[PDB]
């Protein structure tokens, strides 16, 4: 090991791996504890988040061993099977995470489309199981093949595996990184488009309501006229129960008129119900937009630099050449990719589904 990158590695990896370990145990242990708290309602997004956190915490449990490897001067003492498992756990976590994130963004988009619409929980579990099976079967090759002599080396690129990984990169790069990032980019576009259009419509709706209510507030002959115009507009607008409730408000006001204080007072009750109708949409859009922005940032930080540098490192690799500068850049972006496993609970906190509700419930206990 003549190259200087090895001296860099033996100090750098123990630091970042142990930081990720402790931070990731705290975050994921607490997140999983919160998830499993009983709450009157549950959702498929809770399924996807729980699967992500379990995957991340499993991966995090391997990091003290990798740190040990480097702290011993790059000598593996944990046996051949354990080395195999290091490799396998790294890559299974990474791509299961990428797919759980992609599915989560898609789900939030599809939800913001339908704010008023167990059945989908079992489907969420079925989908998770599909993802696990496909990635675990695609990764078993790592389990097939501690190599070194006079010392025991694990975690190292070497001649024996170079051609193999050159082929596998090709697939994982395309199907495991770039295709999901493409899916995310379309999801961002669609989220922004739908959000802008819906909120423009909602502002128009609220504005016309306040116009009609200001007319009723100012000026009984014209009160009935305004209420009948509003009733006709509402009838043409036909959420059957919601429309019926608003129309019953209108009919109660129009009766209290046709029977000036009671009807004008009843006119205000539409305002709070309309504000609640607006807020339902606004909450769905907040959630979808937060999810997609945090997820794109994770991809730009954790996954795309790593896959880029990894690919070039493999393509230019030669037996008797160090390439210490490219190799150092790769080591750093590998740390970032690993660190995703402690970054993800940010998403549970800022875009969870009754996450804070479950947390406040836990705090009561
Ligand atoms: O420390 C250091 O000096 C630096 C790192 C050395 N080092 C250590 C070495 C090591 O791991 O020991 O790895 C590299 C790789 N590895 C790959 O380029 C790879 C490519 C593909 C791959 O596939 C796993 C299974 C993916 C299954 C899958 C999931 C999907 F979602 C979609 C499609 C598929 Cl197919 C694994 C590694 C590339 C460059 C260097 C190293
Ligand atoms: C992942 C990164 C690269 C995404 C950046 C892509 C840019 C080009 C995206 C982000 C938001 C997108 C816009 C979102 C909304 C609309 C309104 C629609 O009526 C025409 C397209 C238009 C104007 C989109 C054009 C493309 C767009 C500007
Ligand atoms: C918000 C999150 C900010 C994350 C910033 C830094 C992560 C901490 C990692 C810093 C570890 C650096 C180790 C190092 O640099 O070691 C090189 C040395 O020269 C080898 O001998
Ligand atoms: C790792 C240990 C964590 C234990 C794994 C948690 C079990 C998951 C579970 O039991 O499911 C809960 C609920 O059904 C969700 O829909
Ligand atoms: C859980 C905590 C594990 C934290 C410790 C994981 C790192 C163990 C370090 C180690 O034991 O390796 C030192 C080696 O003996 C030097 O030659
Ligand atoms: C969790 C990662 C799995 C870690 C594997 C547990 C290590 C087992 C072990 O220490 O075995 C040492 C011996 O050299 C082998 O026969
Ligand atoms: C429902 C729209 C799915 C379009 C995905 C096309 C590309 C598939 C590749 C990765 C995304 C996998 C997401 C599967 C989530 C289904 C809900
Ligand atoms: C909504 C905005 C539009 C969404 C789109 C934004 C995200 C693009 C995603 C993937 C493209 C990846 C393209 C990478 C192509 C590289 C091909 C290449 O460089 O090949 C090198 C060499 O020729 C081979 O051996
Ligand atoms: C780090 C960056 C986090 C950026 C998170 C951005 C969250 C913005 C979401 C939002 O404010 O909602 C917008 C929508 O118009 C309301 O309905
Ligand atoms: C909570 C946060 C936990 C994030 C922990 C690690 C992220 C890895 C970040 C890698 C830090 C890159 C900086 C670096 O590696 O510096 C090299 C040094 O200059 C040698 O020359
Ligand atoms: C590596 C070591 C990590 C192991 C410790 C991490 C904690 C893991 C799971 C904690 C969550 C358990 C919660 C069970 C349900 C409790 C409840 O329903 O109130
Ligand atoms: C992530 C580090 C390496 C992990 C290797 C694979 C471990 C799998 C662990 C947990 C997956 C949980 C499986 C639950 C999904 C099945 C649901 C169903 O079939 O209905
Ligand atoms: C904790 C379990 C780790 C086992 C210690 C290594 C034993 C050995 O030297 O073979
Ligand atoms: C999804 C986007 C589709 C990507 C299509 C082509 C990009 C793949 C080409 C880059 C892989 C070459 C790396 C290598 O030479 O091993
Ligand atoms: C990988 C190659 C990509 C091929 C697919 C390209 C574009 C598909 C875009 C589909 C957008 C349709 C969804 C819009 C909607 O849900 O209303
Ligand atoms: C790039 C392709 C993305 C195309 C998205 C267009 C779908 C929006 C049109 C619509 O649903 O009304
Ligand atoms: C990673 C993100 C890439 C940045 C893409 C830049 C394009 C952003 C375009 C529009 C952002 C719109 C923000 C939402 C405005 C809401 C205001 C309103 O609805 O009244
Ligand atoms: C967003 C970065 C993801 C990974 C980087 C880790 C460090 C980030 C630390 C703090 C970021 C906080 C982002 C909060 C977004 C929520 C905004 C909102 O609630 O509307
Ligand atoms: C981790 C700390 C990240 C910064 C938190 C900012 C709060 C965002 C908010 O206003 O809701
Ligand atoms: C809940 C996070 C609040 C942050 C406070 C900082 C210190 C907290 C650290 C560890 C507390 C561990 C909480 C686990 C105990 C179970 C919770 C309960 O009592 O219901």
Residue numbers in the entry: 29 to 145, 149 to 176, 179 to 232, 1001 to 1020, 1023 to 1041, 1058 to 1078, 1084 to 1106, 240 to 322
Passage from the reporting paper:
CysLTRs exhibit bronchoconstrictive and pro-inflammatory effects and, therefore, have been recognized for their role in asthma, allergic rhinitis, cardiovascular diseases, and cancers. Here, we describe four crystal structures of CysLT2R in complex with three dual CysLT1R/CysLT2R antagonists (cpds 11a–c) and the results of extensive mutagenesis and computer modeling studies.
The engineered receptor was crystallized in lipidic cubic phase (LCP)20 in complex with three antagonists: ONO-2570366 (cpd 11a) (2.4 Å resolution in two different space groups), ONO-2770372 (cpd 11b; 2.7 Å), and ONO-2080365 (cpd 11c; 2.7 Å). Our further analysis, therefore, is focused on the highest resolution CysLT2R-11a structure, unless noted otherwise. As expected, CysLT2R structures with antagonists 11a and 11b are captured in a fully inactive state. A key anchoring residue Y1193.33, conserved in CysLTRs, forms multiple polar contacts with the benzoxazine part, carboxylic group, and amide linker of all ligands. The N-linked carboxypropyl moiety makes salt bridges with K371.31 and H2847.32 that are specific to CysLT2R. Interestingly, mutation Y1273.41W slightly improves CysLT2R surface expression and potencies of LTD4 and cpd 11c, however, dramatically decreases the potency of cpd 11a to inhibit LTD4-induced IP1 accumulation, likely because of a clash between bulky tryptophan and 2-chloro-5-fluoro-phenyl group of cpd 11a. Comparison of the contacts of these substituents in CysLT1R-pranlukast and CysLT2R-11a suggests that in CysLT1R the cleft opening to the lipid membrane is restricted by a hydrophobic ridge formed by F1504.52, F1123.41, and V1965.45, while in CysLT2R the replacement F4.52L removes this restriction, making the cleft more open.
